[PDB]
Structure formats: structure tokens, C-alpha cells
Chain A
């Protein structure tokens, strides 16, 4: 049965102006959930898109699809114009969950250069994914910039074949998973401004 649950909520906070500030939410969900962010009800990061392609690949199988996803929102130069209502919204196709926080900036941003030409940041990722042996699983990463994606397993590069597929949006598709696929997969986002890294985790569950 579909379930969605907050692991780490946003919390209301009074924050110093001009100092970079990062919000984070973690969400446990079956099936896999997507996270987007809102400021005073207006969308500012992420999407409603679900991974319907993987559902097709697993169509007619017994699906586990349980795990935790995480997302960060970075506030570069907090000013009075950034004080307001921030919400992290998780969504799995069946249920919607939302964590809301009042963030008020206390002070002025006399000197603060928000570098648009800063390193890319991985702002959403599959923290953990549980799936049954024999099914397709997907590890998700999303970035705040245009990047090229590279995935690493156990310090070896992941290359496209009939099992692994590195997609251009940031997904790593693993077909016909087996217990030896268990472990950490690092997603690397590279562009002209820098590279970001983020670990994901895959657990193939026993098939009874």
C-alpha cells in the first residue's frame, strides 16, 4: 500500500541576513517520491514528474519500491526579500505530504555576492531505494545547473550496457537487480563551474 512520511521536517527559524542558509527535508515513501519546493506558495525548485518509465519496465511484477529521498534548498544571500513561508512537498503519485517553515531574515545583507557561476549542487537524490531481485530499480539525482552525469560504483565507473543505463536527467537505471548490486552509487554532476557529488544506496530485497 502507498505510504509517505516525513523523515526530517523543515523547522521555522530566524536567520542572519547575508549568510548562506540551507533547508533540507527527507521523505520516506513507497512508491518512490519526488520533492519540490515552494516559497509563499510559488514553486521554486523541482517538479511533479514521477518515474513512470520504471513502472512500465516493472509492469506485471511484484514491486517493493520503498526508500528515502532527500532534497536541499540553498538560500544564497538572505535578505528581507527572502523572509517568508518555505515548504518542501513530497509526492508519490498517490499521496502528497508537505512540511512548512517560517524563515525570517534578521538583519541586512550589506555585502553579499550571490555567484550564479558557482559549483553545481545536487539538490535532490535517492537516499535509499529498496527493490526486489529481478526488478528494475532507479537511483535519482537532480542538479541546480546544466551538468553532465557520471555514476560510480565501488570506485569503478558505471558504463551503459543492458543492465545499467545512465540517463541524461540524472537517473541511473539498473535492470534485473541482484544482491551483488547492493551498495553505494555515487552520482557526479560536472559542468564548467565545478562538480558536485552525492551518494545514493540500493538494496535488492530477497524474492520470496
Chain B
């Protein structure tokens, strides 16, 4: 993996866990991170996809 595509997922998963907490399954957010680092996601999706 390119380092850029690998730091992205790390920072995204940190924001997602910070927003949701226990309400977000770790493997569930890890899938959000993969999607939003390949393609541009909106802010609302990022902040709520793991815990509406």
C-alpha cells in the first residue's frame, strides 16, 4: 500500500471512533475508512456512517 492511502485510513478511523465510541464496531469503521480513502466522502457520511 502507498503510505498516503495507509495514513488516511488511520486518521479516518480515529475520527470515527472518537465520534461514535462503543457505538461503532471497529471492523465496521475500518470499512468506512477504506471507502472514504479511495473515493471522496461527504462530512456527514464520515461522522455518522458508523453510528446513526
Contact = CB atoms under 8 A, between A and B. Distances in A.
Contacts of B19: 28
Contacts of A132: 43
A130 B46 contact: yes
B14 to A, nearest CB: 6
Contacts of A7: 14, 18
B3 interface: yes
Contacts of A184: 3-4, 7
Interface residues of B, number: 19
Overall SS of chain B's interface? helix
User: What is the size category of the interface that chain A forms with chain B?
Assistant: 20 to 34
Contact of A128 (B3, B11, B45): B11
A53 to B, nearest CB: 22
A208 B44 CA distance: 10
B8 interface: yes
B15 A64 contact: no
A206 B40 contact: yes
A64 B46 CA distance: 11
Contacts, number: 59
Interface in B1-18: 3-4, 7-8, 11-12, 14-15, 18
A164 interface: no
Contacts of A5: 18
Interface stretch (A43-51, A79-87, A108-116, A196-204): A196-204
Interface in A4-31: 5, 7, 28
A150 interface: no
Interface-central residue, B7, B14, B45, B47, by most chain A CB under 10 Å? B14
B49 interface: no
A179 interface: yes
Interface of B: 3-4, 7-8, 11-12, 14-15, 18-19, 36, 40-47
